[PDB]
C-alpha cells in the first residue's frame, strides 16, 4: 500500500506507490512474476534499459487509471513498440489506435462456398491474381465506352443525322431517336443502341454475380458504392419497358419530359469510377466528413445572393431599359458574382447599381473562401490517411 | 552484459548496460581505449560536458540497434556536430541525412582531357570565371532573341506584308512565308530567316560541343534538360529538307498541316530558360513530385465537366434557340464555368439551365481547390530546399 516502487528507465527514476502499479495485475508492471527479472537488488530498483520518454506516458497510465496517450516528441513506431513490451494488453492497445486514428478494422469475409468464395475475390480484389487486375482493368474501360458512346447521340453529325434528319413533325418511334436518343428495333439498326445495350450486359454480370456470392445479404443496399450499380441499370429497363409494354395512343400527355428526366439520369453511370479510383473515395469521404460545414457555405451563400439580388435591383429599378427584370432574375447574376464568374449577360448599369454590384464582387471571396479550408484540410487528411 | 555503464552528460545521468555500448565497436561509446579518457573514478561513471537533449537520440541509437533520429527540440546544426563527436561513422550519418532530406549528392565529375576538362566547366558551370558567367548572359539573351523574331513573323505588319500581300491564291514557295513564316534563300532577303537561322547556330555549338565534351556518354539522353536542346533544334532542320530535298508537285495532300504542327513545336524552345532559371527547375521538381496529385485535380474535372455539361443540356434542351447544340459543345462551358474564367459567349437561358449553371460554379471551387495545396505546399518546401 505505502511501500514505494523505483522503476529505474535508463538513468531516469520513476517512483511510484506499490498500489499504483498493481491496479492492473496482467501487466509487466502490475505482475511481481513478470518484472521479478528486471530487479536490481544492490539499487533496490527496478532498471529497464529502454526508451526514455516514452516511460512517462506508461506512468501515467497507470495513475491515471488508464488514460494513455502518445507524448507528442515520440513517434507512432517507437510509442507502439513500447506498448508492446510494458504488456499494456490487446484491450489497450485499441484504445489508443482510435485515439490515434489507426483503425483500419476492414476484414473481408469471403462467401464461405470455397468457390463461391474464391470467385468472389476474383470480382472484389484486383490485387489477388493477375487475371484479377483484368477485370478492373475491363470494367474502367467499359464505363468510358459507354460515355463515349452517350455523349456522342447528341452530337449534330449525328443527331441531326436522326430519322427527322430535317425535323418536321413526332412521331411514337420517333421519339426514342429523339428523347431517348438511339432506335431501339429487334433488328437494331441503330449502332449506338447496340453499343448502349452491351455496356449493360457487363455491368449486371458484374452486378447479379456480385449479388448471389455478398456474404452480407441484407446490409448490400446500405452500402453506397452498390446503390450507384443499381441506378446505372435502371434506365436501360426503363427505356424498354416503354417500349414493350406500351402499344396505345395519348402517353405523351402523361409523362413524357418524364422520359426526358430519365436520360439524364444515366448520366450519374460515371460514378461507378468510385470503386476503382482510390481518389475518388476520399472526396467521397471528404464530402462525408464535412456535411454540416459544406452547409457553412451554401448558406452563407443563399444569404449573400438575396441581399445583393435585391439591393441591385432597387438601384437598377427607374429603367425602362433595365437589365434586371426581377428579383429572381437577379439570382442568377449574383452567383454570377459571387462566384466570380462573371459572364456579361446581365451586368448593372445605373451608377447605384455599380456601387452594389461592386460589393457583392469582394463578399463572394468572403463567402467562398471561409469554410474551403475546412474542407481542404479534411481532404488533404484524408488522402495521406493511406499512410 | 550484465555490467551498467553510467553516463553523466553535463549532469543527467543515462545507466545503460555494457553490451549495449559494445554493440558498435568503433564509436566512441563502444571503443573501451576511446572513452577511457572520460572516466571519473572517484564516481564510477563517464563525464561528458556536452549538448544535454542531443545524447538521448544517441542513447536510443545504441539501444533499438541502429536507429536514431534528431529530436524535434535539438537543430541541425546543434544535433550533427553531436553525431560527429560521438563518432557514430560516416555511414550512420549518411543515412541520417536522407531521412533529414540533406542529400547533396552533387559531384561534377569533369571530362577528364585537362582543357576537354576545362573547357566543358566553361559551358556548364558560370562560376568557374567571369567569362564563364557571360555564356550564360549571352545564351538567356539569345533565347529571348528567337522569340521576339519568332512572335513577330505573325504581326500583320509583317504577315500582311508577305508575298502574298493581298491574299490571292497558294504557291510552293508562298508556303514558306505563309505556313512557315519565313522566305528561305541562299540570298535570305527575308531578315527574320537570317535572325531565325543566327541562333540555331549558337544552340549546336552549345549543345554539340556540350555533347562532345560530356563525361556521361550513354546516359546523356535521360537528363530532361538535354532533351530540350534537342526538341529545339529540329524543326530548322525539317525546314531545310522540306526545301532541299523536294523538287515535285503534290506534296501538300500528302503533309501540309502536318507542317503546320512543326511551326508550334518551335515554341518549346522557351524551356531552353531551365538550364538557368533556378526557380523554373523548382517548377519543374514541383510537378515532378506532384504527379500522381496533379492528376486527382484532372481526374476530378474530368468527372466535374462531364456531369455538369450533360445536366445543362437537357435543361437548356427544348429550345429551337438554345446556346448548347450538343454535349462537348458543353465541354467548353463547364471549363468556362469550373476554372471561373467565365465568358459570355455561351450561357445558359432556361430557368432550369441557370438553376443547373449556378452548381457548377461553386463546385469548380471545390475540385480545383481539393489537390490545389498539396501542390503549393511541395513547391514551397522546393524552393527553400536549397536552405
Known amino acids: 500500500c505505502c511501500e514505494r516502487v523505483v522503476i529505474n528507465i535508463s538513468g531516469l527514476r520513476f517512483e511510484t506507490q506499490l498500489k499504483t502499479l498493481a491496479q492492473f495485475p496482467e501487466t509487466l508492471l502490475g505482475d511481481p512474476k513478470k518484472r521479478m527479472r528486471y530487479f536490481d537488488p544492490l539499487r533496490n530498483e527496478y532498471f529497464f534499459d529502454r526508451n526514455r520518454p516514452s516511460f512517462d506516458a506508461i506512468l501515467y497510465y497507470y495513475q491515471s487509471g488508464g488514460r494513455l496517450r502518445r507524448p507528442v516528441n515520440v513517434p507512432l513506431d517507437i510509442f507502439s513498440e513500447e506498448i508492446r ?14 485515439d490515434e486514428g489507426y483503425i483500419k478494422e476492414e476484414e473481408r469475409p469471403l462467401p464461405e462456398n470455397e468457390f463461391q468464395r474464391q470467385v468472389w475475390l476474383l470480382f472484389e480484389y484486383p490485387e489477388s491474381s493477375g487475371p484479377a487486375r483484368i477485370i478492373a482493368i475491363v470494367s474502367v474501360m467499359v464505363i468510358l465506352i459507354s460515355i463515349v458512346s452517350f455523349c456522342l447521340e447528341t452530337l449534330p453529325i449525328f443527331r441531326d443525322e436522326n430519322e427527322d434528319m430535317h425535323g418536321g413533325g413526332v412521331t411514337f418511334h420517333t421519339y426514342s431517336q429523339s428523347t431517348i436518343g438511339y432506335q431501339q428495333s429487334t433488328s437494331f439498326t441503330d449502332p449506338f443502341f447496340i453499343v448502349e445495350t ?25 452500402n453506397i458504392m452498390n446503390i450507384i450499380d443499381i441506378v446505372a441499370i435502371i434506365p436501360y429497363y426503363v427505356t424498354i419497358f416503354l417500349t414493350e409494354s406500351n402499344k396505345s395512343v395519348l402517353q405523351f400527355q402523361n409523362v ?9 439520369m444515366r448520366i450519374l453511370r460515371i460514378f461507378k469510377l468510385s470503386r476503382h479510383s482510390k481518389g475518388l473515395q476520399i472526396l467521397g469521404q471528404t464530402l462525408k466528413a464535412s456535411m454540416r460545414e459544406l452547409g457553412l457555405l451554401i448558406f452563407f451563400l443563399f444569404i449573400g445572393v438575396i441581399l445583393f439580388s435585391s439591393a441591385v435591383y432597387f438601384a437598377e429599378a427607374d429603367e425602362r431599359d433595365s437589365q434586371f427584370p426581377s428579383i429572381p432574375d437577379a439570382f442568377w447574376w449574383a ?8 459572364y456579361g449577360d446581365m451586368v448593372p448599369t445605373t451608377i447605384g447599381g455599380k456601387i452594389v454590384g461592386s460589393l457583392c464582387a469582394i463578399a463572394g471571396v468572403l463567402t467562398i473562401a471561409l469554410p474551403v479550408p475546412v474542407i481542404v484540410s479534411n481532404f488533404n487528411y484524408f488522402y495521406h490517411r493511406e499512410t
Chains 1, 2 share one sequence.
Open 335 to 342: 452567383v454570377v458574382s459571387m462566384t466570380t464568374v462573371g
Open 256 to 264: 413524357r419530359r418524364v422520359v426526358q428526366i430519365f436520360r439524364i
Open 198 to 222: 452491351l455496356c449493360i450486359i457487363w455491368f449486371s454480370f458484374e452486378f447479379l454475380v456480385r449479388f448471389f456470392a455478398c456474404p452480407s445479404k441484407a446490409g448490400f443496399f446500405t
Open 85 to 98: 513490451f510494458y504488456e499494456l494488453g490487446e484491450e489497450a492497445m485499441e484504445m489508443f489506435r482510435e
